């Protein structure tokens with residue numbers, strides 16, 4: 338939980354998140370784009386009715402509920418397959 | 434019938450209409466009037 342860096346008085350609307358995408362997101366793929374979601378059959382490009390921005394604000398304030406707090410989430414991905422490695426932990430070097 | 438009334442009650446006594454046993458046509462929510470505010474909060478206005 339990080340309510341001290343993603344919160345300040347008078348609010349903070351810096352962060353973003355997407356709800357309108359043409360299809361699903363493939364694993365580990367980034368779809369950074371500003372394309373207005375099509376609704377109905379209009380080629381409309383902009384904000385307003387039936388023309389919505391794909392990404393909405395993730396606005397954060399110091400006074401929310403627990404489920405609405407600015408949780409800081411870092412995911413770690415590991416690749417343990419038959420290949421030369423790079424990262425380890427404690428290591429002893431007894432001779433062969 | 435709920436969107437074409439003539440005696441919309443005052444705010445101090447807001448008339449309540451119960452909606453059930455239907456299929457929810459939503460093109461009427463779009464074509465009716467040029468509109469002035471369409472702020473949706475919990476449900477996506479197109480994924481409804």
Ligand SMILES: *[C@@H]1O[C@H](CO)[C@@H](O)[C@H](O)[C@H]1NC(C)=O
Nearest residue numbers: 360362363365366367368369
């Ligand atoms: C990569 O580009 C293709 C073709 O435009 C697109 O279908 C796909 O979703 C893109 N992938 C990412 C990483 O967004």
Ligand SMILES: *[C@@H]1O[C@H](CO)[C@@H](O)[C@H](O)[C@H]1NC(C)=O
Nearest residue numbers: 434436437438439464465466
């Ligand atoms: C309301 O109903 C009358 C007839 O019942 C109709 O003529 C009128 O067009 C309706 N109002 C709107 C805004 O369509």
Ligand SMILES: *[C@@H]1O[C@H](CO)[C@@H](O)[C@H](O)[C@H]1NC(C)=O
Nearest residue numbers: 440442446447448449450451
């Ligand atoms: C709305 O107004 C109609 C007509 O006056 C009335 O019959 C109905 O009971 C009202 N609905 C309320 C008060 O919830």
